[PDB]
Design a protein around this ligand. Sequence first.
Ligand SMILES: Nc1nc2c(ncn2[C@@H]2O[C@H](COP(=O)(O)OP(=O)(O)OP(=O)(O)O)[C@@H](O)[C@H]2O)c(=O)[nH]1
Ligand SMILES: Nc1nc2c(ncn2[C@@H]2O[C@H](COP(=O)(O)OP(=O)(O)O)[C@@H](O)[C@H]2O)c(=O)[nH]1
Ligand SMILES: [Ca+2]
Ligand SMILES: [Mg+2]
Ligand SMILES: [Mg+2]
Lengths: 70, 440, 421
Amino acid sequence: KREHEREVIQKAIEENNNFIKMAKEKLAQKMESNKENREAHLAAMLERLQEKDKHAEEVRKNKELKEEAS
Amino acid sequence: MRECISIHVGQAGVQIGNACWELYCLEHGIQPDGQMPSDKTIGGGDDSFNTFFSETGAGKHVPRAVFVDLEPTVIDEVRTGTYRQLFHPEQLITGKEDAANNYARGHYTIGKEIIDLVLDRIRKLADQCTGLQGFLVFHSFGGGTGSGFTSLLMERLSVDYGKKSKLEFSIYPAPQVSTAVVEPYNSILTTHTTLEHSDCAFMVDNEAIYDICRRNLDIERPTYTNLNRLISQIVSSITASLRFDGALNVDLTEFQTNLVPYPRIHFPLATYAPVISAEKAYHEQLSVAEITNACFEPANQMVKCDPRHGKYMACCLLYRGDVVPKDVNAAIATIKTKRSIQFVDWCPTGFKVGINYQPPTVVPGGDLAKVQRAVCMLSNTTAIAEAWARLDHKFDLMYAKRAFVHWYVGEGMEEGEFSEAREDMAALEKDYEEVGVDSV
Amino acid sequence: REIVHIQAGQCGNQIGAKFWEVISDEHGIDPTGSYHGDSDLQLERINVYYNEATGNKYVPRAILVDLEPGTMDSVRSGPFGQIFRPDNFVFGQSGAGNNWAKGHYTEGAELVDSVLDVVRKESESCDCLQGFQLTHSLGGGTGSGMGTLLISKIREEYPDRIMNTFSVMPSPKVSDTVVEPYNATLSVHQLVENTDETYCIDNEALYDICFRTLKLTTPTYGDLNHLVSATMSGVTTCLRFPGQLNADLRKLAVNMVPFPRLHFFMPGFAPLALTVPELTQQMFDSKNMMAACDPRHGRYLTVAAIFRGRMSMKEVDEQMLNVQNKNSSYFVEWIPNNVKTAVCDIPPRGLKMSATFIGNSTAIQELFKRISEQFTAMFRRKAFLHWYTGEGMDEMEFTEAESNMNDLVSEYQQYQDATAD
Ligand SMILES: Nc1nc2c(ncn2[C@@H]2O[C@H](COP(=O)(O)OP(=O)(O)OP(=O)(O)O)[C@@H](O)[C@H]2O)c(=O)[nH]1
Ligand SMILES: Nc1nc2c(ncn2[C@@H]2O[C@H](COP(=O)(O)OP(=O)(O)O)[C@@H](O)[C@H]2O)c(=O)[nH]1
Ligand SMILES: [Ca+2]
Ligand SMILES: [Mg+2]
Ligand SMILES: [Mg+2]
């Protein structure tokens, strides 16, 4: 009976610790996944804007070649 | 004497906190500067009111509370208001930018920047407790902070305090006073993520409170202040057994044993009476039987739903003021012979009763008559699942077109979390269905 | 908290100056920048649009931009001309010749970095920047072309802030002519990708209102701009006074924009006995719209209503519920509770009470369809293209802009046709 009493309380400790652990790991995965997602969103936004800039240069370079003909 | 720490999150949470703490100060004889003349033990003690208030050697009684919001203007009014001396400045915590009605900003983008400071501040409160019982967490479903930051906080509290009890007071949205089209999204997301981290949650349907103020107090167009004063009476009824002692007093945790048959089925329906104006209360003494009867009138519930069309799994009556068991028992026998109170078949049908002898108090310049006796009924009924049904339906309408979803995806969330949250709600609605089916 | 204001080009600076005069009066700030008001509610949120300098002086957080000095000099002499920060005038000389390409790619490109220097200065000292509002027209060259360039550049440096525009659409009824459809279409192309919320201020509508409703046979830009400023004051009141609803630019966008591209709003105003039931009927009527579109020809995705003055809150709630009940077919069923209402005690100048309306309606396609038609009738003949190729652009960009705008139209139609079932 004493052995069973010891197993019950150890089982209770083990489940509380497993609950805490499970919660800790899931939060960490969510915050990590979220950070990566958000940064990728911003990165694609900037990469579109830097294309607009590349096309603007391309346009002024284009005017400079047709003002030479002339 | 087991301490309880209250945490008030976002505008609704903070403003309800203002109303609750003012009311507790009045009930306990505590002045706006924290001084309590009737308290003869200076600098500490183990009186019932100490579960909610600590004490300094200067005789100040300090709420065991933290107020948190991601923008500063609501808490700033506490900082500069009537009860500003009540709180240590470090108990009032603000960021610079709110969650813009977006769960994702509350839980991740903005919330992550302040979460560590909040836990640090809660920790300081817990360190002053000799036998912390648990937390009471006040917040809206619909706001970005109320929803997203509260979820993040509940997850972190489970990690840091284990299975230490966490109870919520949750403001369920109504269109009469809502401020965001996306409140159904935030409600479902927070309910999903918080479900496993909460022991007991008391939902307060702003529409139920709005309609009680209009109908019972004759307020043409209720403001938050009208709603919040009513809400604080209800919150006070619920916490009174922790704050006052007495022979017939029964502890909230004892009601909780009866209220929660399975971990997920933990949303009691509160009903409160009497709600009546001074003008109608005058020369009209409301007996134990009248207020008890009012508890079974759905118009007096804090959530709109119909218990007559569901089954009870528990019924608790928390009386306060001038009330003796004889009159309670007579009143209950009457209700039993005349009302549609049907229990599930696996639960006993007895009403659990507690009586706190300290009569209710009202805030000066409020709407409620001062009465000699009041009652809050807490029931566990399958009917509360209607509240989830209504919210889940609004979620489905918008989600089928992914309306507004880009605001969440842009803050780093995935569609996966929406469907996961929605499915957990579907399973919850189903759980409430199953507990009402007769045993085989 | 802080909003940064940018005004570009002639139209941009004219409606911009009117905006500051009107709100300065509402806030009790005189032209010297000194406060002389009666209500503390005037100052509670003054920082949203104003900087405080020593001497308790309030300076609009405003940046004035043009490729010629004309209008800007007119501003500096205007009534509130001295209120502005002198360093915040950034004018060139070149000019844009009503040419989007010049404003966007060449001339404007030349002045842009000096504008950014001012934006960055104003931004750096902000407790917590909300974002930006730009006033400009889409028909000219500077406001349209350089205005869209500035939006792009600012977004690159402030990708996480809200970008809001007040964009004046061109009309033959007011027309500076003649390549305006090109400028507008090239502009809308930019607005669709790079702003979070655009108020479509339609000269077609301002004209029809001055002429038909106000009974002005000969409407000046002055008469148009009274409408514009009354509107702009209205749609910013929730930003400028204490309150609950749409109190900042992000919360407004989250309430108003269900899909990222569908962010073009039809604003409305009333009045143009005046009871709450009457204000309400008026702000929802096509004749009171600042965009030339009939909302009975589409469906409302979302709506914001702002009532101003002393009136019954109960009455407002009832009339607003009544409008929705009686007109249910014109509000999409799959966005519940999509109409939000705010009431502010402080009325605009010269009115006891007023109502401002902000609608995201699929009927806004009538506006884009009208521009698209005028664009295609010129483009099919390749008329005046040389003004644009002459700065380095290919026809491709015209074809792309046309397409993107036609896509926008199709997308409004898609959601208009959508059903809950
Ligand atoms: N009963 C009651 N409800 C409130 C109160 N304040 C806000 N609400 C409700 O709460 C919801 C809006 O959430 P808030 O608490 O204001 O938002 P928040 O937590 O501050 O989150 P963000 O502002 O997005 O950072 C709506 O359903 C409001 O009606 C209040 O004082 N009392
Ligand atoms: N409502 C209004 N429209 C204007 C005003 N000034 C110009 N516009 C319109 O703006 C367009 C011309 O662009 P404009 O701003 O004047 O050229 P810009 O200086 O290159 O930006 C035309 O459609 C005009 O009708 C004004 O003060 N008010
Ligand atoms: Ca003591
Ligand atoms: Mg808030
Ligand atoms: Mg011009």
